[PDB]
Sequence to fold (331 residues):
Amino acid sequence: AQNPNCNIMIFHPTKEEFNDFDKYIAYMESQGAHRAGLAKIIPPKEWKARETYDNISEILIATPLQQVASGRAGVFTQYHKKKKAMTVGEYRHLANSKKYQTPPHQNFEDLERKYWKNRIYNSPIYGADISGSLFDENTKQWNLGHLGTIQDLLEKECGVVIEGVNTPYLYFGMWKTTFAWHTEDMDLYSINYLHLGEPKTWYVVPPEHGQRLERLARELFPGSSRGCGAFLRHKVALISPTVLKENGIPFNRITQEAGEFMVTFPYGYHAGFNHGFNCAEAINFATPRWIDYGKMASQCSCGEARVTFSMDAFVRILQPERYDLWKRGQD
Ligand SMILES: O=C(O)CNC(=O)C(=O)O
Ligand SMILES: [Mg+2]
Ligand code: NI
Ligand SMILES: [Zn+2]
Fold:
């Protein structure tokens, strides 16, 4: 069995190996990368996502989200308060302001300490989930707006044509902006490219141990757990590395820098935070190996998780017994 300790693997594909996306994901898996839940891919030196980032300031962040925490430093939830629209240029200025900028620090480890110690006492503003792409149309390799669609994958594997589309999303971050513990919709893969700016730290639980995390979360968020049998689908709960270590939950951590891709694997729980102003792009995708995960994925039917149009067909086809209850939660 490859990678039996479930360590995060880092890959350095050549320009020739960067041509065929599906084949390279399958290569990574042949080496055990999926066991960690997360892998890093450093593009060949010849590659670029686009020529420059000099002309992105007029992108609109229609609904910036202020991330307000409740709880204790290591065990907290966050809610998202909607703020007035602002441009990327306005957001970048805000991120760099004295109120929101990254504090002085020695290294990534010192910053991580300061995050966990102090996150709850601040409410950073995240420009998340913005439909769009920063890849140049002429970038042919690992262009997240030109991947094979999940609908086409389901059709190729299962023979059923379905409605729906699959497009990327932009995330503009600042110091302490936070992504809560989650897996993807329908336990899909995700791919994330950090276009520019400051790093993003990730934490991940191996897929084979995801239920250990779920059991801890039910213990630590007992009201939430009574409200919904899949409440981590709400994407609101944070648990620190210290707490995870105290409770014996297996996990790993890694920092992504500008110019690097991360891939999350089916049923790989992940969480993290941004170090300062940055812009990432991400999209879900599928492979043949995903289908069995999609068939087994938990679902939120309490009404909170509320998701895209395109998840309908996945539930309808892969989880017909669950469909009626899940759709009630959508409506
Ligand atoms: O970057 C973020 O805020 C969150 N990203 C992911 O959860 C992902 O790419 O799967
Ligand atoms: Mg612009
Ligand atoms: Ni994710
Ligand atoms: Zn729910």
Summary: The radius of gyration is 19 Å.
